C-alpha cells in the first residue's frame, strides 16, 4: 500500500451532507494526468465570519494574504515546503483530495496545531519496569471528552503559539500551574509536518508539531507536580494514564503519532 492520505480521501466529509469525487491511487498526485477531475467547491457556512479566513469564496479579490509566509496573525507557512499556488488558491502538497474549498478548517494552506505527548514507564508492585517478550511498557496520559467517543492526546489548535499549551489544557490542567507546565514543556521533538485528517480539502490541511516530554524515574520528582497540577475537569469528562498497545483505543490518526513515538524509546507494538 502506497503511503497516501487515505483518511482525507475518505468519502462523506464530516458534519456536512456532501460527497467528494472518487480519487483512486493512480489519480492522487498532482503530477499525473487526470482530466475528468471535477472536485465540488464546498466551504462550511460558519467559515464566513471573523478570526477564521474570509477566503472561503476567494474568486473575489479578498484573497490578498501572503502565501507560504507569516501573513500577520496567521503564520500561513508550511513545515513541509513551499506549496504551489494556482488561481490564488493553495493546493494540497500530498495529492488530490477530491474536495475543493475551505472545508471546516480555519485558513487555507496548512493549519498549524500542536500535539504534545507525555510518556512514562510502567512499574510493577515492587517498582521495576514491566516487560513484554523483548521490549518494555510505556504509559501515556490521555483525555476523553464527553462528546467524542474517542480518547485523544491533550493537544489543541495552535492559534496562539505558547498559550496553545494552555489552550489545550484550559479546561483540563490549570490556569496558574498551566504556565508552569508550559515552562516545562520544552522537551524533545519527534515529527513535524503534514498529518492525515478527515477534515482536509485540496486547499486546507493540517500540519503539526509533536514534542515528547518524558519521565525517566517513576518515584518523587516533577511527576508529583504534574499529579499535583490536577484540576482535571472543568468541561471535560475524564483524564487518566493508559498503557501503550497497538490495540490502544484512541483517535484514528493519533496512533500514527504513537507508532512514531515508541520508536524513539524502543517499546513494543
Amino acid at each position: 500500500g502506497d503511503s497516501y492520505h487515505v483518511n482525507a480521501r475518505h468519502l462523506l466529509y464530516p458534519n456536512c451532507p456532501v460527497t467528494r469525487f472518487p480519487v483512486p491511487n493512480e489519480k492522487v498526485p498532482w503530477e499525473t494526468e487526470f482530466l475528468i477531475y471535477d472536485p465540488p467547491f464546498y466551504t462550511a457556512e460558519r467559515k464566513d465570519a471573523a478570526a477564521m479566513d474570509p477566503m472561503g469564496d476567494t474568486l473575489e479579490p479578498l484573497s490578498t494574504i501572503q502565501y507560504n509566509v507569516v501573513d500577520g496573525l496567521r503564520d500561513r507557512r508550511s513545515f513541509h515546503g513551499p506549496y504551489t499556488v494556482q488561481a490564488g488558491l493553495p493546493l494540497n502538497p500530498m495529492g488530490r483530495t477530491g474536495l475543493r474549498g475551505r472545508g471546516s478548517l480555519s485558513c487555507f494552506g496548512p493549519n498549524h496545531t500542536l500535539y504534545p505527548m507525555v510518556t512514562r514507564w510502567r512499574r510493577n508492585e515492587d517498582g521495576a519496569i514491566c516487560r513484554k517478550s523483548i521490549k518494555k511498557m510505556l504509559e501515556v496520559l490521555v483525555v476523553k471528552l464527553p462528546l467524542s467517543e474517542h480518547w485523544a492526546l491533550p493537544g489543541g489548535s495552535r492559534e496562539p503559539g505558547e498559550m496553545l499549551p494552555r489552550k489545550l489544557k484550559r479546561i483540563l490542567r490549570q490556569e496558574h500551574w498551566p504556565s508552569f507546565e508550559n515552562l516545562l514543556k520544552c522537551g524533545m521533538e519527534v515529527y513535524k509536518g503534514y498529518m492525515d485528517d478527515p477534515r482536509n480539502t485540496d486547499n486546507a490541511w493540517i500540519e503539526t508539531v509533536a514534542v515528547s516530554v518524558h519521565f525517566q524515574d517513576q518515584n518523587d520528582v516533577e511527576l508529583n507536580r504534574l499529579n499535583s497540577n490536577l484540576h482535571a475537569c472543568d468541561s471535560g469528562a475524564s483524564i487518566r494514564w493508559q498503557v501503550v498497545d497497538r490495540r490502544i483505543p484512541l483517535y484514528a490518526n493519533h496512533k500514527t503519532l504513537l507508532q512514531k513515538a515508541a520508536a524513539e524509546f524502543g517499546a513494543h507494538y
Binding site: 508492585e125 517498582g127 519496569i129 516487560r131 513484554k132 517478550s133 517513576q218
Partner: protein
C-alpha cells in the same frame, strides 16, 4: 518425612556471600547492589565487618561460603492445582551421588529405564498445530510406556512450557499410573520471582507459591506442570545459566548407573530431543555429540533446528561459510542483522563437527518420510546409536535385545532386532528369556517360542532352582 527433614540440611550445602563491595552500575530501581545485591544494602547475612582488608574485585569462590540450606520442602501452586510438588535448593557444586541418593532414597523414585533431556529455545515462540499434536502425543507416549525421567529447565517460558502442556494433557487423560510421568526441572535460585516466600528453615512442608505472568522483571517464574524442582544456587541474583554445568554432570553420572532386573543388567541410556533453540542450544548439541549421546532434532518451527535439518543432508565439505550465513539470515532475520561476521565461522565449524558424526544425529522429517511417530523415531535413533558403538564379538546384538526387553514394548524388537542379519543360535537367546519369564511378559515369551527356543532343552535343574 521427619527423617527426610533431618537428613536434608545435614547433607546439602548452599552458597551465600559474606562481603559487601558496591557495584558501579546501579540496577533498575534497586540501585544499592553489593556485587550481588540480594536483599540489603550489603550482600550478606553476616555482621558488617571491615574483614581486615577491602578486597576490590571480589573473587567469586574466594568471597562466598557454604552453609546449611533452608529452602527445602514441598510446594503447591495457589489456585491452579491441588497436587503437591517436591522441591529443594542445592549449591552450585555438589557431588552428583548426593543428589541421586536424595532422588532415589528419600523422595521415593525408582531407577529410570531411560533419561530424556529436552532442551530448546527459552524465548517464546509458536508452531504448527499438527506437528504440535504429534510432538505432544509422541513424547507423552514414550515417557509413559518406558517409565522414563524427563529433565528440563524449570521455567515457564519456551519449550519447557510446551513440555508442561503435554504433561498437563496426560494428566487430563489420567487413564492409569499418574506417577509414571515424573518431570524434574533444574533452575537457578536467583531468577525466581517470589522466592522470598519459599525461604523458611527446618522445613516449609506446605509452601504456597503464587505466580503472576508478565508482572516480573528479567527474572522469571517457575512452571506449574513440573513435578520435581532442583534449584541450584551460586549466591548471585542477576545471572543466567548456573544450572548448565550441573545438568551435564548429573546426566553423565546417571548414565553409568546399572538397573538390574531379573537375570539381565543394563546401563541407563540417555537421549536428548531438541527444539527451536538458540546459540546455547547449538553448544549443548555439540557438547552432547562429543560425548556420544544421540540427538533428535525436530524439523519445522525452529531457527537452529531448521538450520541443521536443511544442512544435514549435504556432505561436510560442501558446507561453506557463505551458505551457512545465507541460511542464517533467512531464518533469524533480526539477530542475523545483529550478528557479527566473526561468530559465523565458529557456527559453521560447530555445524560441520556436528554433521560429521552422521550416526548420532537424527532429523525428524515430519510428515515426509519415516514419520510413523515420535516415539518410534526416538527408539530407532537410540538403538542405531547403540548399534554404532565399537564392540568385540557379537555382544551388541545381545545388548540391544536386553534393552528392548527392559522396555516393555515388543514391536521394536520384532521390527529390527529379529528382522535380519544376526544368524544367532537359540541357546544364546536363553538368559533374557528367564527375565521375560520372571517379570510376567507373555508377549516376549511368545516371540521367543516363535523364534525357536526349545522349552525341553531350556528348563534344566539349576534354572528351575533359580526360577523358584
Amino acid at each position: 518425612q521427619e527423617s527426610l527433614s533431618s537428613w536434608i540440611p545435614e547433607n546439602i550445602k548452599k552458597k551465600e556471600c559474606v562481603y559487601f563491595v558496591e557495584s558501579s552500575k546501579l540496577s533498575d530501581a534497586g540501585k544499592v547492589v553489593c556485587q550481588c545485591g540480594y536483599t540489603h544494602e550489603q550482600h550478606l547475612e553476616e555482621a558488617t565487618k571491615p574483614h581486615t582488608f577491602q578486597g576490590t574485585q571480589w573473587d567469586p569462590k574466594k568471597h562466598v561460603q557454604e552453609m546449611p540450606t533452608d529452602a527445602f520442602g514441598d510446594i503447591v501452586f495457589t489456585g491452579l492445582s491441588q497436587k503437591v510438588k517436591k522441591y529443594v535448593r542445592v549449591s552450585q557444586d555438589t557431588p552428583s551421588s548426593v543428589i541421586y541418593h536424595l532422588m532415589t532414597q528419600h523422595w521415593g523414585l525408582d531407577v529410570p529405564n531411560l533419561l530424556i533431556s529436552v532442551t530448546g529455545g527459552a524465548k517464546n515462540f509458536n508452531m504448527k498445530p499438527r506437528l504440535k499434536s504429534i510432538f505432544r502425543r509422541g513424547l507423552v507416549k514414550v515417557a509413559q510406556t518406558t517409565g522414563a525421567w524427563i529433565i528440563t529447565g524449570g521455567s515457564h517460558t519456551g519449550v519447557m512450557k510446551q513440555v508442561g502442556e503435554a504433561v498437563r494433557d496426560f494428566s487430563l487423560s489420567s487413564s492409569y499410573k499418574e506417577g509414571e510421568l515424573i518431570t524434574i526441572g533444574v533452575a537457578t535460585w536467583g531468577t525466581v520471582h517470589r522466592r522470598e516466600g519459599l525461604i523458611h528453615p527446618t522445613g516449609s512442608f506446605p509452601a504456597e507459591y503464587i505466580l503472576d505472568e508478565d508482572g516480573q522483571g528479567n527474572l522469571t517464574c517457575l512452571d506449574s506442570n513440573h513435578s520435581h524442582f532442583i534449584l541450584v544456587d551460586d549466591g548471585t541474583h542477576g545471572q543466567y545459566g548456573v544450572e548448565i554445568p550441573l545438568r551435564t554432570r548429573l546426566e553423565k553420572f546417571i548414565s553409568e548407573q546399572t538397573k538390574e532386573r531379573g537375570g539381565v543388567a543394563i546401563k541407563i541410556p540417555i537421549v536428548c530431543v531438541v527444539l527451536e533453540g538458540g546459540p546455547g542450544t547449538l553448544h549443548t548439541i555439540d557438547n552432547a555429540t562429543t560425548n556420544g549421546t544421540p540427538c533428535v532434532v525436530v524439523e519445522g518451527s525452529g531457527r537452529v533446528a531448521d538450520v541443521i535439518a536443511q544442512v544435514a543432508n549435504l556432505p561436510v565439505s560442501d558446507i561453506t561459510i557463505s551458505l551457512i550465513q545465507q541460511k542464517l539470515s533467512v531464518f533469524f532475520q533480526e539477530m542475523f542483522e545483529t550478528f557479527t561476521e566473526s561468530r559465523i565461522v565458529e557456527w559453521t565449524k560447530k555445524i560441520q563437527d556436528i554433521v560429521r558424526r552422521r550416526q548420532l544425529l537424527t532429523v525428524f522429517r515430519e510428515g515426509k518420510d519415516g514419520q510413523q511417530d515420535v516415539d518410534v523415531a526416538i527408539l530407532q535413533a537410540l538403538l542405531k546409536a547403540s548399534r554404532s558403538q565399537d564392540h568385540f564379538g557379537h555382544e551388541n546384538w545381545d545388548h540391544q535385545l536386553k534393552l528392548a526387553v527392559a522396555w516393555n514394548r515388543v514391536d521394536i524388537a520384532r521390527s529390527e532386532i529379529f528382522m535380519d542379519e544376526w544368524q544367532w543360535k537359540p541357546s544364546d537367546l536363553h538368559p533374557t528369556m528367564t527375565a521375560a519369564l520372571i517379570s510376567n511378559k507373555p508377549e516376549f515369551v511368545k516371540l521367543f517360542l516363535e523364534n525357536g527356543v526349545q522349552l525341553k532343552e531350556f528348563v534344566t535343574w539349576d534354572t528351575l532352582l533359580y526360577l523358584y
